[PDB]
Amino acid sequence: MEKEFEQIDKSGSWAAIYQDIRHEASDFPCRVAKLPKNKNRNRYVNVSPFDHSRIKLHQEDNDYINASLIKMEEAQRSYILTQGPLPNTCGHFWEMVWEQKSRGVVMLNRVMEKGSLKCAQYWPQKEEKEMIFEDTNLKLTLISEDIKTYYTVRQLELENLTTQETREILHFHYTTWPDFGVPESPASFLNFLFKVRESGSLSPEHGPVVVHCSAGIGRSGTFCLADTCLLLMDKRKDPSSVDIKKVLLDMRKFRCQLIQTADQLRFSYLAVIEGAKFIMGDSSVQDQWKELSHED
Numbered sequence: 001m002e003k004e005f006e007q008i009d010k011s012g013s014w015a016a017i018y019q020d021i022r023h024e025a026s027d028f029p030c031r032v033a034k035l036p037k038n039k040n041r042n043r044y045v046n047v048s049p050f051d052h053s054r055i056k057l058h059q060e061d062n063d064y065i066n067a068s069l070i071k072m073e074e075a076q077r078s079y080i081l082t083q084g085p086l087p088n089t090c091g092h093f094w095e096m097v098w099e100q101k102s103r104g105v106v107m108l109n110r111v112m113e114k115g116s117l118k119c120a121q122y123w124p125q126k127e128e129k130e131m132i133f134e135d136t137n138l139k140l141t142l143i144s145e146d147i148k149t150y151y152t153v154r155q156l157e158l159e160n161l162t163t164q165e166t167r168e169i170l171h172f173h174y175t176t177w178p179d180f181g182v183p184e185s186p187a188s189f190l191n192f193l194f195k196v197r198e199s200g201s202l203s204p205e206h207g208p209v210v211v212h213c214s215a216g217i218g219r220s221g222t223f224c225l226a227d228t229c230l231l232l233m234d235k236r237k238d239p240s241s242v243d244i245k246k247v248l249l250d251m252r253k254f255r256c257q258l259i260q261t262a263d264q265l266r267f268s269y270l271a272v273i274e275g276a277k278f279i280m281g282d283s284s285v286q287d288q289w290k291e292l293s294h295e296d
């Protein structure tokens with residue numbers, strides 16, 4: 001990837017490669033997304049889940065959410081990628097987290113960005129003010145939170161009000177990754193990815209992690225592409241056998257248009273190439289990312 005990276009950079013060809021990926025990517029129907037009744041369930045008219053990998057809500061009324069299951073078979077990790085919840089679909093989002101048995105929610109965007117409300121405020125910002133989502137009968141409380149300078153970790157309690165079963169959900173909120181943008185550095189992104197990893201939420205005893213940005217494609221695609229490249233590499237301890245563009249194409253079978261610009265593609269190569277130092281047995285790089293990232 002690293003010889004590949006410098007051949008791309010050297011000849012200024014990131015947009016054409018990105019363009020090429022774009023022409024190779026799958027396209028499957030998104031007919032349920034586009035039903036008239038689901039119009040207000042999609043944030044963006046042109047970003048829909050394919051029918052074959054969409055998450056169905058376990059409810060008879062209307063089972064649709066804008067969300068897909070990215071099942072990475074070789075890597076043996078799955079993720080749910082979803083749009084930032086809308087004001088009428090926060091109760092569906094939480095219904096999805098409960099039914100799917102997810103332990104973690106990775107949020108890569110802010111509620112407000114570039115002057116616009118890119119996502120609903122779907123979680124409580126304070127402990128005394130729980131949310132009840134009456135359409136899906138679910139209660140959520142802020143148990144606490146750890147605010148760093150570029151991310152915050154929250155612990156949430158999700159109650160299914162129908163059984164009174166309770167689960168803890170960890171929320172990993174990256175607050176300084178710009179829409180259509182890249183993280184400040186490979187260090188700080190890697191520091192963030194490894195916080196999520198260490199917490200256990202990626203672990204196969206749990207449902208798939210839920211990753212969202214505002215559309216569930218650009219920042220989320222970038223997050224997942226890095227994670228999975230690094231997992232692949234880990235399982236074989238063989239960096240040279242991971243084909244990043246080929247992993248992004250496999251992920252694009254399950255949701256359209258994963259990774260939104262050519263600099264996000266380029267950052268993913270940066271992230272995986274740096275992350276490999278750690279996968280290949282230099283644990284010291286991890287606490288270096290931590291220093292560089294200025295987390296406190």
Ligand SMILES: O=C(O)C(=O)Nc1sc2c(c1C(=O)O)CCSC2
Nearest residue numbers: 044180213214215216217218219260
């Ligand atoms: O949130 C991201 O990282 C991302 O993919 N966002 C996307 S992808 C996308 C859009 C947006 C957006 O937020 O405006 C606007 C419609 S075109 C494709």
